[PDB]
């Protein structure tokens, strides 16, 4: 089909109820994909949530290092545009997984981290603070981390971080965006702030470099962000958008991406809004 046609069907299906029914029918975890490493005794407490685990096939491995991390490669292709948007989707680090988190960032010289959670919710810790408050310097697994800049906007905090390899003396800079106006299991507090943030993240991509995206579990709010970026690329290229195909494609790489029906409805509505705003 076409962008126009897909948007007609999405509009109609939003009004029907059919897009939500097909969403609830979709598997959360792809049947047949092995999940073994994540459940080993030495790895169980490296998962923030017992039921949010990486598939073996797309699990991120540390270079020449056997340590496990709960993280998944997630790549979204737009073949008609010879385009692949790469991500590493991961959980909020735990105190004892900060070393592995920063090792992924170092291994792959990732320049952009997108964090879609506050540190705490309702008196409980949802992500370890794996960076230091400026101007402190923090050690994690033989990386020193310092926050060189910290600036708050409405909806998010932008930090520039310096990662130093203690073994080698090498340095790497990372941009870190913490979206703080988006509670777990919910929709963003403001749709317009969210859309602007997504387009800002797009603009900060480095060629063929994955964006590291995480939340607390790294599936709900991350899935929404990924869905939206994908849809923005498609809409700008006049290509059809099937949100269910996009969610399925993510879930073939990391189970459970896009947690709630309310999140799926939100992103479908936002996709329609962007198409219509942009339509000439």
């Amino acid at each position: 089909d076409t962008l126009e046609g897909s948007m007609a069907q999405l509009k109609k299906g939003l009004e029907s109820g059919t897009v939500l029914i097909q969403f609830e029918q979709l598997y959360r975890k792809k049947p047949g994909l092995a999940i073994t490493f994540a459940k080993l005794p030495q790895n169980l407490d490296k998962n923030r949530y017992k039921d949010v685990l990486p598939y073996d096939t797309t699990r991120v491995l540390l270079q020449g290092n056997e340590d496990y991390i709960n993280a998944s490669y997630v790549n979204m292709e737009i073949p008609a545009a010879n385009l692949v948007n790469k991500y590493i989707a991961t959980q909020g680090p735990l105190p004892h997984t900060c070393a592995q988190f920063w090792q992924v960032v170092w291994d792959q010289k990732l320049s952009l981290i997108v964090m879609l959670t506050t540190l705490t919710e309702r008196g409980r810790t949802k992500c370890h603070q794996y960076w230091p408050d400026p101007p402190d310097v923090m050690n994690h697994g033989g990386f020193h981390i310092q926050c060189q800049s910290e600036d708050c906007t409405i909806a998010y905090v932008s930090r520039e971080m310096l990662v130093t390899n203690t073994q080698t003396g090498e340095e790497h800079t990372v941009t870190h965006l913490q979206y703080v106006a988006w509670p777990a299991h919910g929709v963003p507090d403001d749709s317009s702030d969210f859309l602007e943030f997504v387009n800002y993240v797009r603009s900060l991509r480095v060629d063929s470099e994955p964006v590291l995206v995480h939340s607390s579990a790294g599936i709900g709010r991350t899935g929404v962000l990924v869905t939206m970026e994908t849809a923005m690329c498609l809409t700008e290229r006049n290509l059809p958008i099937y949100p269910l195909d996009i969610v399925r494609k993510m879930r073939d790489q990391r189970a459970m991406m896009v947690q709630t029906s309310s999140q799926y409805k939100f992103v479908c509505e936002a996709i329609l809004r962007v198409y219509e705003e942009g339509l000439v």
Binding site: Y49, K50, I219
Partner: peptide
């Protein structure tokens, strides 16, 4: 170990 809440 806890499940991710709904």
């Amino acid at each position: 170990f806890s499940a991710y809440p709904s």
